[PDB]
Amino acid sequence: QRWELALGRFWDYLRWVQTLSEQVQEELLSSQVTQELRALMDETMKELKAYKSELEEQLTPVAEETRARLSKELQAAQARLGADMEDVRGRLVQYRGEVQAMLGQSTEELRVRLASHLRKLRKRLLRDADDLQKRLAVY
């Protein structure tokens, strides 16, 4: 669970950014949440790498070159998750700039759009974390 507990925190913070409260919106226009999100993503990847590395002592490789198949699949499940986390971080970096371009105008429509976009990106990150939990469990 260390990587899972590290991801649970990436995920809880994002659930909070998704509400777009006054505080989210404040911190959204500085680098504060994209930077805090970057730290949590890094820690999830850090912990994930270290976990697969220590799981690779336990294994029974009795169907030979299938462990290769298995590992290169698990290494892409991993790359999926990191990309996902980075897509979110980047929709958020786009937001800050779309607001700067409005020039004081009402950002209420950008916020309605941001939200349904983030809802999708989080649905994606959640099925890819699930799939990554599956592969890591055939280990």
Question: Is 124 annotated as contributing to ligand binding?
Answer: yes
Query: Which residue, 83, 84, 67, is CA-closest to 135?
Result: 67
Query: Which residue, 80, 90, 79, 5, is CA-closest to 40?
Result: 5
Distances (CA, A) of 44 to 3, 81, 106, 139: 5, 10, 36, 19
Whole-angstrom Cα distance, residue 67 to residue 111? 46
Q: Among all chains, which residue has been given the structure tokens 């913070």?
A: 13
- Split into its structural domains, the chain has a count of 1
Cα 67 to its chain centre, rounded Å, is: 26
Scanning 29-138, the segments in alpha helix (DSSP H) are: 32-55, 66-102, 108-136
> For the chain, what's the residue count?
139
Question: Is 69 annotated as contributing to ligand binding?
Answer: no
Query: Which residue, 91, 97, 108, 85, is CA-closest to 13?
Result: 85
- Resolution in Å equals 2.5
- Domain containing 42 equals 1-139
Query: What CATH number has the domain bearing residue 133?
Result: 1.20.120.20
Query: Which residue, 49, 50, 61, 46, is CA-closest to 139?
Result: 61
Answer positive or negative: Cα dihedral of 63, 53, 55, 57: positive
Question: Is 125 annotated as contributing to ligand binding?
Answer: no
Distances (CA, A) of 92 to 82, 122, 138: 16, 13, 35
Question: Is 123 annotated as contributing to ligand binding?
Answer: yes
Count Cβ atoms below 10 Å from residue 3 Cβ, excluding itself. 23
Distances (CA, A) of 57 to 51, 52, 71, 85, 131: 11, 9, 13, 28, 22
CB 3 within 8 A of CB 44: yes
Distance spanning both ends of the chain, measured CA to CA: 14
